[PDB]
């Protein structure tokens, strides 16, 4: 279950660095779900190749 | 007798009469190159013929 997908790397607000600083902010590309299947397109060999 | 015009006695004006013949050549830019060795079992087409 690997896939490719563009994506951003968050930008969070710094309006206050204490509360900012007291939650763990992170960001991984870790997914919780695998996307709808109406919107995967399948890629093979022989697709690529033609 | 032979039936063919081999040698004719012609008027000046009409030295350039025996050009009626088309000629097609190729332009400078282009290259010609021969693919008779490509002949070798062992490739592959990237589509695959019916």
Same mark, same amino acid.
């Given at each position: %279950?690997? !896939? ?5 790397? $968050?930008? $969070?607000?710094?309006?206050? #660095? =204490?509360?900012?600083? %007291? =939650? &763990?902010? !992170? ?5 919780? +779900? $695998? $996307? =709808?299947?109406?919107?995967?397109? %399948? !890629?093979? !060999?022989? #697709? +690529?190749?033609? | 007798f032979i039936n063919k015009r081999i040698v004719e006695r012609?008027?000046? &004006? %009409? #030295?350039? +009469? ?8 190729? /332009? &400078? /830019? ?9 002949? /070798?079992? &062992?490739? /592959? ?6």
């Amino acid at each position: %279950q690997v !896939y490719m997908h563009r994506d951003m790397l $968050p930008e $969070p607000r710094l309006d206050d #660095i =204490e509360r900012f600083r %007291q =939650e &763990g902010f !992170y960001y991984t590309n870790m997914l919780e +779900a $695998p $996307p =709808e299947i109406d919107r995967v397109v %399948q !890629y093979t !060999y022989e #697709i +690529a190749r033609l | 007798f032979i039936n063919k015009r081999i040698v004719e006695r012609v008027r000046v &004006g %009409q #030295i350039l +009469a025996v050009l009626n013949r088309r000629f097609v050549a190729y /332009k &400078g /830019k282009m290259r010609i190159m021969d693919i008779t060795q490509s002949l /070798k079992m &062992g490739t /592959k087409l990237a589509a695959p013929t019916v």
